[PDB]
Amino acid sequence: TPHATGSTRQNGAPAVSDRQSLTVGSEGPIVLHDTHLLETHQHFNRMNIPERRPHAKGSGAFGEFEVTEDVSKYTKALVFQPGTKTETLLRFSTVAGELGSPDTWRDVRGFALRFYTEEGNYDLVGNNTPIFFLRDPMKFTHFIRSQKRLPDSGLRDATMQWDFWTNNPESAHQVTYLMGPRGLPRTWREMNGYGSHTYLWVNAQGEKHWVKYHFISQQGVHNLSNDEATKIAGENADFHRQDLFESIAKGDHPKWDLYIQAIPYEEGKTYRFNPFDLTKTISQKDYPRIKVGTLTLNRNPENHFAQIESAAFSPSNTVPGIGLSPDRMLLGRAFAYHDAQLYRVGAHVNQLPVNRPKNAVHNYAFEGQMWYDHTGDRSTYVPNSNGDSWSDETGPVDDGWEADGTLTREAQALRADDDDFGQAGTLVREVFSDQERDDFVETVAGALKGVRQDVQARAFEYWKNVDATIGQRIEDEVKRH
Amino acid sequence: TPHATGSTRQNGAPAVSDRQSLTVGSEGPIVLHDTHLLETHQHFNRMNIPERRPHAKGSGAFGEFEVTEDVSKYTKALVFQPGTKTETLLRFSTVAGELGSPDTWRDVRGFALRFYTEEGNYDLVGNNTPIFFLRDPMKFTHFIRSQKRLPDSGLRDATMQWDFWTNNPESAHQVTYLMGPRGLPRTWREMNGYGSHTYLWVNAQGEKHWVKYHFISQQGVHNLSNDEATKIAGENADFHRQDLFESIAKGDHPKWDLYIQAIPYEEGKTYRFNPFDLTKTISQKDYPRIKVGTLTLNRNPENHFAQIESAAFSPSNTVPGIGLSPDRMLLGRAFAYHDAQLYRVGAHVNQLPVNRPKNAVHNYAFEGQMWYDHTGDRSTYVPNSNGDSWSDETGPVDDGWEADGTLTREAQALRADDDDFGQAGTLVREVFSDQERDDFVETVAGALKGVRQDVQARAFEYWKNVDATIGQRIEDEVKRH
Amino acid sequence: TPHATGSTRQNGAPAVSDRQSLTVGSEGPIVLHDTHLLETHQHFNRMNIPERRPHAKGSGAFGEFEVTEDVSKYTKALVFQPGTKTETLLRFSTVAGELGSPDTWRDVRGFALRFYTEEGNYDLVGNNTPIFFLRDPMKFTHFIRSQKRLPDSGLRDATMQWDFWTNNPESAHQVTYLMGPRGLPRTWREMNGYGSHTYLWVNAQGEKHWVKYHFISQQGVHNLSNDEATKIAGENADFHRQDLFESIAKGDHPKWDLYIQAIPYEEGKTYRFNPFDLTKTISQKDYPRIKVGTLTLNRNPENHFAQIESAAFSPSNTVPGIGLSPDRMLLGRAFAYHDAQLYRVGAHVNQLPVNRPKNAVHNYAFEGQMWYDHTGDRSTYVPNSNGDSWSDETGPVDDGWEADGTLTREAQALRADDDDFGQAGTLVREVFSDQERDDFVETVAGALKGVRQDVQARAFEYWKNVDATIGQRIEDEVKRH
Amino acid sequence: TPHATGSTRQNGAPAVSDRQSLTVGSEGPIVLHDTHLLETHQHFNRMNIPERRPHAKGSGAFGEFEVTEDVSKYTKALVFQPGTKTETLLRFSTVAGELGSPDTWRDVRGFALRFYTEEGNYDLVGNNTPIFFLRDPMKFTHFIRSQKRLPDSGLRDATMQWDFWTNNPESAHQVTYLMGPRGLPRTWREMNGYGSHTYLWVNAQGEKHWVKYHFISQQGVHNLSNDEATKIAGENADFHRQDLFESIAKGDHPKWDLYIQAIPYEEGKTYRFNPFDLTKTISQKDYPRIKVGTLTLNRNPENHFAQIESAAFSPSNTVPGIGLSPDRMLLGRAFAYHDAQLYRVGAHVNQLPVNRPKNAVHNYAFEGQMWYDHTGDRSTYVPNSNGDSWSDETGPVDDGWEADGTLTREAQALRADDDDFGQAGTLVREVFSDQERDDFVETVAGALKGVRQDVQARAFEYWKNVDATIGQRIEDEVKRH
Ligand code: HEM
Ligand code: HEM
């Protein structure tokens, strides 16, 4: 245009200057009607949004999922039908640290995967562990607070962390996994991902299986030592973010193979470990892995904030053929994510490009702040006599199950082999090597250093419950100093 | 898709039912993981946004502006060059009432006009009056609060309104206009619009004129009586909204002619009324109207909320060739609108379709909640060595003026004919007819009924200052009851 | 202080002027560092908060509840033990109109009552009707949207309202009540309040009764005609608000008597009308009213916004001895209110004085915006070893019940006398008088005027289902015009 | 109370369990009406607020300021009158990193000090440097973005930082200070604080001086090496936060002495360095330091979030006797802080206990979200006839100055010794030691490693402009690798 200057204000008119304010002479005050200054500063002041809680610190990439086996006998979901290729988005993260925190702290890592399927966005929001610390969502707020900062000093605190874990012994399986080698992945490319929960798969005939998801890295599982991780935390707080971005940019596209475990509907009720208990794995002897397909990440974001920070994943984002399960943790998650995203991003978070599905949305939601894609004169109510369609399926849902009882607050009933310490003990005695046990003792003793004496004594009892020998070695190492 | 049901959730998957919740059997409780119920209720709960303050209650339409005369000697603005046609949006409103308040209350009406020009959105945010009640923005918050509700009872209150007006005698010109016939327009189609403020026009050679805008209705000015307006308020609270929507729908497209008054830069400093005082008109004897063009409204909104409620107008939205003026009220407005819109709508209010310009925006603003149109890897700083342009014009701005003095808080200096009551007195004695004066006395006496005695006595003095005779008639009518 | 000026800025320093802005000389521009101007305008721009949806328009008063009978055999709740006196807050409202809408429109009225009890705030959030239009919360968003504005024009629309009601015939009982005399209360003092839902009462021995609440006005039930209500809507949009405020100010304190109906736990499952269906009343022949006590309103708010607009009521605010019931509508409400209030007011809405309980709050919630009353160094997790207490009751809850079934979306099962039109027909034929039936025909025919022909035909069928004779009279009146 | 359980919900009623959710039998789904679960999760999801931008990462303490000298000849401010003792709050921070970022990165440190004075909160919001990188606020948004993350990868980037600095050569003085020893303080206790800007002091007779503030640590200035800082960043990201909290807890109370430089009003216009240019120091030869008093920090926060994270400091928080100056940067800050705080914390941020003044606030601001301390029935407008006071001082303000010119966007005029590189050159050649110059060369060469070649070449030219020798050594070190 004839009056252009190189940039505009928000109304599209020339900005005049991005470098100097509007003043009364060169020595005078800034005037109130420097609207370019006001607009740019007001926007700057509103750039930051609340960080996620948990999983604030993370990054990710786009890719593709390709089905390479036939699992139509287990699910009718379009995404998993033979040959299907689907675009994906994967965000990796740590659990406890804030936006600016080092990537190489000892922590659980998130593995949040979206499939842009032809029947909607399917989100599989997993971790780099098959289990979690808890089995009821009422405890989750407590757990995450115990992993963050003391209320007075603003410092993370080992006493608080161990006080919570030792008073919640359901934590023992995941704490063992976390304190083992896998607590410190070398890169996100060299860790596995897991759904952790049991999900329901429903086939075209209406038959149900309980499934676990396992994403096995084709780059192998590789871990850092405590010393190596500390050093990297000081040298490069964004070590994992950079590693992923630079690997993809140079064409070194990471891959994972997806396998499921499939338990028949009726055997879910009788298996010796509760499949609806998030602190339990399903033995690969009883239920071996079945191959589904391969995930590849092959495209970096163009804008990290718009495509990764503003991405909103939810386990509630199921597609036909895939349902939730009786797992209390999973049912808590069905509520919590969308709720957080309305505050963190806004009411219309799911209209942002990264969160939009590929298929047509026809949803009964109107108005609200920042409504970019309005529904014109579509009817706002159902049934209507205006030809604007609605859903009205009645009766049992395809992805459901049964329940019976009185309203209660209590622990899940124990199956034959259920307890708090058994699987942890197997991991320590049978899965770890001798050298991994030595490292484990050092890791756990390091973590208990400076823990208040009463809590430290409870931690020794906890580790002896996991394994009498490991527990004694940890106590001896702590007392040796 | 094969599993469709008639509508979707927000992730695009089938909703299953828009009519029944997910329960444990037909008689059981609703389950927490009824995510369709949660999403639709959470969205419903976030549909309402803060109403505008002031001007909450309003509606509008799209149209066109066509230049039919040559005013290139006064401005280089593209919108006003010979022959130019521009799409427009016009929102009409009342000042004091809330979202659900009757259209036919006695009030100032807003006349908010946007031109989608080739060099950006130009907003002329006017009223149905050429003047306003005040001449310094510090008093505006006080004024609007006095026009709303008492803090204890939540009732509008005549005592509060007259207490403010009589203690702020600058109000007299606009209060006279408001209490006259034009306080009650029959329809928005039958009222005039005015910029009210003086604006600066700059031509291609850099010469400046001070201008006033006058939009003269081609449907004439027609008004209701007090009794007629009261009756309509009870029968149809949305009388004006409906009138406009139904007039356009049946092809009865309303029109206004735009005229300006143009005062040479140097005569602005010497004119006998202060052109930078928003309580003053410029006499049509001294500065006659010059025709510019014609505004037509010819298209109803498709979605009232997205296109009218979410529209964000600002006097700060100037285009090259048009600037603000020394008027303190106008300079206050340059800050206030954008600020309100960041809270009312959101940081990215100007990315909503109705607020987007027609030309390319290249603005240094990134991130924030609800960022729909991201800037990819564009540089976030200036100067940069990446070929992402910026503005850096130095020296006096084209749409500026001079100032000199010490930092002060005080009234504007009086010109030869400036005072608080003169122009009001002219309106009453010379512009109104005899019958309009009779109606005026009745209107003002009605408004003063039940005003607390000390404030009512100050109101009699105020009206006698406007005109000794009108004031005595008002006092006599009030005392007669 | 020695430098005082009459008012302060937000930091407590002298404001200097509430009336003039800071300028470069008397004729110069406003400077950016007029911080008093900025602060007052930025606050002004953030004064408005989202209106409630529904029930935007309302007002209320404080009072007292006094138990005058013995109902300890039905509940252990402290509020209802013999002799107990409790402070109360009552907010009245209409359902569909916005903040500025006339009080005297035909509508359901809200009757929202809080008791500040010694074991927490007990909220009984009722209406001026014992029933509602719907029995599943999934339909509530649809219903409220159908009662508001068309998406294109922003007008309320009779076709939309009747299209929703006739396609949802469960609506017939409440629509009959609404179109009858009680749709237009003369004052809030002259209407009854009802809980509408069945609630659970639990006594000290753990025995359960299902209860309905009935608040019978001691001023009687008095109603306006259509013509009278229209006239008042034009003359005084705040007629009910003013009536209540002025009645209390002059010592005319309104009173209601509270009665319950009490159904034994086991008879709830077998009664011939479903007590868990919000469209049904419980016959006073089967279950007569039992007197509890008297509510009096005797104190106006000191600040309407802080004490009434910012009040946050929720059916989830139960106290020991009182629980929710299997009613799907009530269980939907347990989620929805708190969710809306977090957006409308803020995360810490329940720390505002009006929403705070009288007893000590010891809640596991920390941080968030606007945290006025912080918890110092209290532990943020449970169990802790720091002596900060927590709750851990296990097993069946005292205020619970049983369920069994598969996850389904379907209508509640019908009891012996359940249907959509029976109770409506009783209200029309047996409860109304002859003159009330004549008025009813006129009201309903008036409401159907200008309803689109296909929807109007469905409305005639609907009214004939209610009562063959009333339906024919309505059709004949509509066709007569 | 008789039904207590150990904790409450938000309404004060017993929570029943903080550890288990409400389910249909022990194996069943969670019910929607688990309101304790919903409330605790909804609050958890709203705990995080937007981090500050800049200065996200910080901590602080309470203390006292004691005047020990007589400066009444320079100011009438109550806080600085002989003998006066005032409570203080001090927040320390880094500029560029996010909430979780290591304390021991090379950066400017903030020194934000509040005095709770008897005439309002006085905020002196300083840095650990007397200068800044820029002299016009229009460039500040650009600068801070260049110090944060690349838009595509989310990585901090040396090229972006040096591209901005070398294209903005006004940056040279502060960049030299930053790349010197003081870029890495050992603890916050061992750094100085400075106002950086010139402020105006006005005495009881109305005489003005331009002042600079200098807070000289009584613990001395001590710094880390690059290697030491890197190591600590990996071992303890919260090293400075912990150091301060633990020093105060053990009674090792840090102290600073406050000195001012005082330039007579008229000499401000003629001094050879522009005192209104934030990139310039005032020579201690021309204007020696004058002692005022001593700051001590002696009390840790009880709640870090409520007292430190939610603290809202602003340079606009002046008190009588202290004003802003012509410095464009300072005038930009007068707007920006309050604006950011309305979004970050909320409209009523200044009612939170930490932000409240000690004296009585009488401010014309009403309503808004989260209004804890309402104004009852106080008048909402001025003048009023209700005895609610207001300010109306007219004429020149006590803390003002003069201006004259046309509206312009351009660089400040140069004084006799003003340029971009002179003071930087003095710091390098005269203030640093030989060993500090060696470390400087290593620091700057390290920072330029991997900077894109075109930008690196501009950086060599920039450092040669600072000092021909230092610049050549830096170039040689970079090329040596
Ligand atoms: C009851 C337990 C849990 C609750 C209440 C919960 C809640 C949340 C919330 C509120 C967020 C932030 C969402 C946002 O702002 O966008 C989040 C993020 C996340 N959660 Fe959970 N969570 C739970 C358990 C788990 C489990 C068991 C896993 C893995 C199996 C998991 C994996 C994640 C991941 C990967 C993210 C980050 C997603 C992303 O990258 O955006 N969480 N969680
Ligand atoms: C210093 C004086 C004034 C201030 C501080 C002020 C401020 C405001 C604010 C904050 C809004 C709401 C903006 C939004 O949320 O989108 C508004 C709306 C409006 N103002 Fe003003 N105003 C002032 C004077 C005037 C004057 C003098 C006129 C006419 C000449 C005017 C006409 C309007 C109109 C028409 C609207 C509604 C715009 C729309 O339809 O969206 N105001 N004003």
Query: What single string gives the DSSP state of each residue in C318-341?
Result: --TTEE--S-HHHHHHHHHHHHHH
Chosen from D335, D380, D388, D397 to mutate, greatest number of chain B CBs within 10 A: D380
Which two tokens mark B287? 């500065």
d(CA B20, CA C132): 16
Q: Which fold has domain D58-355?
A: Catalase HpII,  Chain A, domain 1 (2.40.180)
The ligand that comes nearest to the alpha carbon of residue A329 is 1
Instruction: State whether residue D320 sits within 8 Å of chain C by CB.
Output: yes
Instruction: Spell out the residues 6+ positions from residue A451 whose beta carbon is closer than 8 angstroms to its own.
Output: A158, A159, A162, A459
- Given a contact as 3+ CB pairs under 8 Å, which chains touch A? B, C, D
Q: How was this structure determined?
A: cryo-EM
Q: How many CB pairs under 8 A join C and D?
A: 333
d(CA D221, CA D211): 23
Q: Which run of H or E residues covers position B396?
A: strand B395-396
Which two tokens mark A432? 């770890």
Cβ–Cβ gap D385/B163 under 8 Å: yes
Whether B137 lines ligand 2, by a CB cut-off of 6 Å, is yes
**Ligand 2 centre from B337 Cα, in Å?**
7
d(CA D15, CA D3): 10
Instruction: State whether residue B409 sits within 8 Å of chain C by CB.
Output: yes
Cβ distance B393 to A17 under 8 Å? yes
Among A31, A167, A168, the residue with its CB nearest the CB of C29 is: A31
| Closest residue, chain B, to D382 (C-alpha) | B142
Q: Which run of H or E residues covers position B298?
A: strand B290-299
The ligand that comes nearest to the alpha carbon of residue A144 is 1
C55 catalytic, yes or no? Answer: yes
Catalytically active residues of A are: 55, 127
Residue whose C-alpha is closest to residue C179's, from C193, C161, C196: C161
Whether A212 lines ligand 1, by a CB cut-off of 6 Å, is no
Whether B333 lines ligand 2, by a CB cut-off of 6 Å, is yes
In the 8-state DSSP scheme, what is residue D183?
Answer: G
d(CA D322, CA D192): 22
| Closest residue CA from atom 17 of ligand 1 | A54
Whether A91 lines ligand 1, by a CB cut-off of 6 Å, is yes
Residue whose C-alpha is closest to residue D148's, from C453, A99, B362: A99
Cβ distance B294 to B148 under 8 Å? no
CATH 2.40.180.10 assigned to A58-354 = yes
C-alpha atoms less than 13 angstroms from C-alpha of C344 in its C-beta half-sphere: 24
Q: Which ranges constitute the DSSP H helices of D345-452?
A: 422-426, 434-448
Burial class (CB in 10 A: 0-12, 13-18, 19+), D373: exposed
Residue whose C-alpha is closest to residue C284's, from C221, C189, C194, C185: C194
Cβ neighbours, 10 Å, residue A435: 9
Q: How far is C9 from chain D (nearest CA, A)?
A: 6
| Closest residue CA from atom 3 of ligand 1 | A333
d(CA A2, CA A389): 50
- Coil, strand, or helix at residue B190? helix
Which two tokens mark B4? 């469709």
Instruction: State whether residue D151 sits within 8 Å of chain B by CB.
Output: yes
- Given a contact as 3+ CB pairs under 8 Å, which chains touch B? A, C, D
d(CA B158, CA B107): 13
Q: Which residues of B touch A31 (CB under 8 A)?
A: 331
Q: How far is C29 from chain A (nearest CA, A)?
A: 7
C-alpha atoms less than 13 angstroms from C-alpha of B358 in its C-beta half-sphere: 15
Q: How far is B144 from chain A (nearest CA, A)?
A: 21
d(CA B271, CA B267): 6
d(CA B231, CA B227): 6
Instruction: Tell me the DSSP string of D201-254.
Output: EE-TTS-EEEEEEEEEETT---B--HHHHHHHHHH-TTHHHHHHHHHHHTT---
Among D150, D375, D454, the residue with its CB nearest the CB of B385 is: D454
Q: Which run of H or E residues covers position C457?
A: helix C453-466
Cis ω before C29 (30° cut-off from 0) = no
Q: Is D265 annotated as a binding residue?
A: no
Whether B93 lines ligand 2, by a CB cut-off of 6 Å, is yes
Return contacts of D472-478, CB within 8 angstroms, 24+ apart.
D473/D441, D474/D441, D474/D444, D474/D445, D474/D448, D477/D441, D477/D442, D477/D445, D478/D445, D478/D448, D478/D449
Q: Which residues of D touch A107 (CB under 8 A)?
A: none
Output helix, strand, coil percentages for chain C, rounded to the nearest 5: 35, 20, 45
C-alpha atoms less than 13 angstroms from C-alpha of D73 in its C-beta half-sphere: 7
Output helix, strand, coil percentages for chain B, rounded to the nearest 5: 35, 20, 45
Whole-angstrom Cα Rg for chain C? 26
Which two tokens mark B94? 């009342």
Spell out the domain ranges in chain B. 1-47, 58-355, 422-480
Cβ neighbours, 10 Å, residue B475: 21
Residue whose C-alpha is closest to residue D369's, from C199, C49, C151, B239: C49
Which two tokens mark D15? 């929570």
Cβ–Cβ gap D384/B163 under 8 Å: yes
- Coil, strand, or helix at residue A44? helix
| Closest residue, chain C, to A335 (C-alpha) | C335
CATH 4.10.91.20 assigned to C1-47 = yes
**Ligand 2 centre from B109 Cα, in Å?**
11
B60 pairs with which residues across the strands? B91
Burial pattern A371-387, b for ≥16 Cβ within 10 A else e, equals: bbebbebbbbbbbbbee
- Coil, strand, or helix at residue C87? strand
* Among D36, D121, D127, D240, the one annotated catalytic: D127
Tell the residue number behind the tokens 């989620």, with chain if given: C335
Instruction: Spell out the residues 6+ positions from residue A474 whose beta carbon is closer than 8 angstroms to its own.
Output: A441, A444, A445, A448, A460, A463
Measured from the CA of A313, which atom of ligand 1 is nearest? 41
d(CA B369, CA A49): 6
Instruction: State whether residue B6 sits within 8 Å of chain C by CB.
Output: no
Q: How far is D470 from chain C (nearest CA, A)?
A: 41
Interface of C with A in 156-175 (CB under 8 A): 160, 163-164, 167-168
Cα torsion through C292, C397, A400, A195, rounded to 10: 130
Chosen from B52, B99, B226 to mutate, greatest number of chain C CBs within 10 A: B99
Instruction: State whether residue D455 sits within 8 Å of chain B by CB.
Output: yes
Instruction: Spell out the residues 6+ positions from residue C158 whose beta carbon is closer than 8 angstroms to its own.
Output: C447, C448, C449, C450, C451
Instruction: Spell out the residues 6+ positions from residue D405 whose beta carbon is closer than 8 angstroms to its own.
Output: A23, A24, A25, A26, A27, A28, B402, B403, B404
Q: Which residues of B touch A307 (CB under 8 A)?
A: 374
Which two tokens mark A123? 């989100």
Distances from the Cα of B455 to the Cαs of A94, B164, B167, B467, in angstroms?
Answer: 66, 9, 9, 19
Cβ–Cβ gap A48/B391 under 8 Å: no
The number of angstroms, rounded, from the C-alpha of C345 to the middle of its chain's C-alpha atoms is 17
The domain C58-350: what is its CATH number? 2.40.180.10
- Coil, strand, or helix at residue B168? coil
Distances from the Cα of C313 to the Cαs of C350, D75, D438, in angstroms?
Answer: 10, 53, 68
Which of the listed residues B91, B114, B125 should we mutate to test ligand 2's pocket, taking the one with most ligand atoms within 8 A of CB?
Answer: B125
Which two tokens mark C336? 């929805």
Q: Which run of H or E residues covers position A296?
A: strand A290-299
Dihedral sign, CA of B350, B356, B361, B366?
Answer: positive
Q: Which residues of B touch A338 (CB under 8 A)?
A: 10, 35, 38-39, 42
Cβ–Cβ gap D53/A45 under 8 Å: yes
d(CA B35, CA A363): 13
Instruction: State whether residue C140 sits within 8 Å of chain D by CB.
Output: no
Q: Which residues of B touch A5 (CB under 8 A)?
A: 391, 393
Q: What are phi and psi of D241, to 5 degrees?
A: -55, -45
Q: Which residues of C touch B46 (CB under 8 A)?
A: 50, 343
| Closest residue CA from atom 8 of ligand 2 | B337
Whether A158 lines ligand 1, by a CB cut-off of 6 Å, is no
* Interrupted after residues, chain B (C–N over 2.5 Å): none
Whether A137 lines ligand 1, by a CB cut-off of 6 Å, is yes
Burial pattern A170-203, b for ≥16 Cβ within 10 A else e, equals: bbbbbbbbbbbbbbbbbbbbbbbbbbbbbbbbbb
Dihedral sign, CA of D213, D219, D221, D222?
Answer: negative
Among B160, B400, B408, the residue with its CB nearest the CB of D406 is: B400
Instruction: State whether residue A361 sits within 8 Å of chain C by CB.
Output: no
Beta strands in C300-424 (DSSP E): 322-323, 395-396, 402-409
Which two tokens mark D12? 């004060």
Q: Which residues of D touch C22 (CB under 8 A)?
A: 397
Q: How many CB pairs under 8 A join B and C?
A: 299
d(CA B134, CA D237): 56
Dihedral sign, CA of C79, C83, C89, C90?
Answer: positive
Q: Which fold has domain D422-480?
A: Hemocyanin, N-terminal domain (1.20.1370)
d(CA A170, CA A151): 25
